[PDB]
Design an enzyme around this catalytic site. Sequence first.
Site, mmCIF file in Angstrom:
data_model
loop_
_atom_site.group_PDB
_atom_site.id
_atom_site.type_symbol
_atom_site.label_atom_id
_atom_site.label_comp_id
_atom_site.label_asym_id
_atom_site.label_seq_id
_atom_site.Cartn_x
_atom_site.Cartn_y
_atom_site.Cartn_z
ATOM 1 N N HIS A 76 -12.466 -28.994 -19.738
ATOM 2 C CA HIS A 76 -13.919 -28.827 -19.601
ATOM 3 C C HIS A 76 -14.316 -28.501 -18.156
ATOM 4 C CE1 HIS A 76 -18.205 -29.763 -19.466
ATOM 5 N NE2 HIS A 76 -17.964 -30.806 -18.703
ATOM 6 N N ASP A 77 -15.187 -27.493 -17.934
ATOM 7 C CA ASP A 77 -15.504 -27.048 -16.547
ATOM 8 C C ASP A 77 -14.226 -26.848 -15.707
ATOM 9 O OD1 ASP A 77 -18.357 -26.731 -16.315
ATOM 10 O OD2 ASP A 77 -18.578 -28.944 -16.326
ATOM 11 N N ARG B 146 -17.431 -21.392 -16.513
ATOM 12 C CA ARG B 146 -18.877 -21.266 -16.439
ATOM 13 C C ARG B 146 -19.182 -20.499 -15.219
ATOM 14 N NH1 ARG B 146 -20.898 -25.639 -18.771
ATOM 15 N NH2 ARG B 146 -19.442 -26.414 -20.396
ATOM 16 N N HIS C 292 -20.550 -24.985 -11.508
ATOM 17 C CA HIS C 292 -20.963 -26.109 -12.354
ATOM 18 C C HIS C 292 -22.488 -26.191 -12.206
ATOM 19 C CE1 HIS C 292 -21.974 -30.267 -13.472
ATOM 20 N NE2 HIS C 292 -20.822 -30.356 -14.125
ATOM 21 N N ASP D 159 -11.992 -33.722 -19.882
ATOM 22 C CA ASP D 159 -12.002 -33.813 -18.450
ATOM 23 C C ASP D 159 -10.632 -34.349 -17.923
ATOM 24 O OD1 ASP D 159 -14.597 -32.800 -18.250
ATOM 25 O OD2 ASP D 159 -15.535 -34.708 -18.103
HETATM 26 O O1 LIG Z 1 -23.580 -29.837 -19.322
HETATM 27 C C1 LIG Z 1 -23.202 -29.435 -20.640
HETATM 28 C C2 LIG Z 1 -21.728 -29.630 -20.869
HETATM 29 O O2 LIG Z 1 -20.917 -29.064 -19.779
HETATM 30 C C3 LIG Z 1 -21.413 -29.063 -22.269
HETATM 31 O O3 LIG Z 1 -20.064 -29.337 -22.658
HETATM 32 C C4 LIG Z 1 -21.841 -27.570 -22.404
HETATM 33 O O4 LIG Z 1 -21.638 -26.996 -23.671
HETATM 34 C C5 LIG Z 1 -23.342 -27.533 -22.230
HETATM 35 O O5 LIG Z 1 -23.974 -26.291 -22.527
HETATM 36 C C6 LIG Z 1 -23.622 -27.988 -20.821
HETATM 37 O O6 LIG Z 1 -25.014 -27.916 -20.684
#
Ligand SMILES: O[C@H]1[C@H](O)[C@@H](O)[C@H](O)[C@@H](O)[C@H]1O
Length: 306
Positions: free
Chosen positions: A28-29, A65, A78, A279
């Site tokens: 994630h991220d 992202r 982020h 994470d």
């Molecule tokens: O902060 C959130 C998070 O990172 C989620 O997993 C993502 O899908 C969302 O759109 C984001 O707004």
Amino acid sequence: SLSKSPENWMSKLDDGKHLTEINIPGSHDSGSFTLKDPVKSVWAKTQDKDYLTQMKSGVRFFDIRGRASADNMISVHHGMVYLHHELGKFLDDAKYYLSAYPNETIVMSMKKDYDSDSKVTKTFEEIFREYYYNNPQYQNLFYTGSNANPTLKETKGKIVLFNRMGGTYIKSGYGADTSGIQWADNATFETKINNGSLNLKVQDEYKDYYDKKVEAVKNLLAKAKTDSNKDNVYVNFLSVASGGSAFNSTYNYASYINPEIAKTIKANGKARTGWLIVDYAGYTWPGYDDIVSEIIDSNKLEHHHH
Ligand SMILES: O[C@H]1[C@H](O)[C@@H](O)[C@H](O)[C@@H](O)[C@H]1O
């Protein structure tokens, strides 16, 4: 045992499997490993390993992202926070990796995380499509096939786009159609993607407190365990937002949830999990089960003679 050699675990599977049917660890991220400031990392940092190390740990779904900071440039982000690098760095790392390990495939989620600089004329999707997906630099790098539900055999050595940009004119990858993916906020939901060919089932309840989050993850994990439909794609995010007051860092959260979910996976034996997005992918703690390894090992190896 697949988790002993996380660098090349997909190469060990039957290549006739749809990617949808493989249990895949994601991060994630993913590009947030660049942050070092201790205050901002509490909430903005979700990974400590760089892309290459995450790949070597068996991560195959990447949550990228971005923000367009100029007409020909997507910076990795982020939300408002710049993560010190552009999209080209991830694409170069995946290219090198897929060269060294040519029977793996990588799924790359692409999402706009912040408003473009006011001098930017193009939409985020135009920039991604023109400067990256169609960049001759990345010539053999992306999946360009016409199969809405591709197999491992079809995507070996490539990045398959997972489109969270909205409508697109790209024709290959998950949500690669003019409608894109309708993504519900802070929820568990389902939506048909790829002109109706696939049923996408998401748990993305990113504001949940611990107990509610664990149940949402387990609920989607239970649905997956009993569902052998190839046209169903499961995306199950173990990550939650850190909070500015309810100070429990993304790292603290992950140290609870990742082992808890790893233990449930291990107890279920080899059974479909879907794609679990975490994470601190690859971060181990002595005496706690490891979510990445258990996702990898949850894949069933059918036994054929040699
Ligand atoms: O902060 C959130 C998070 O990172 C989620 O997993 C993502 O899908 C969302 O759109 C984001 O707004």
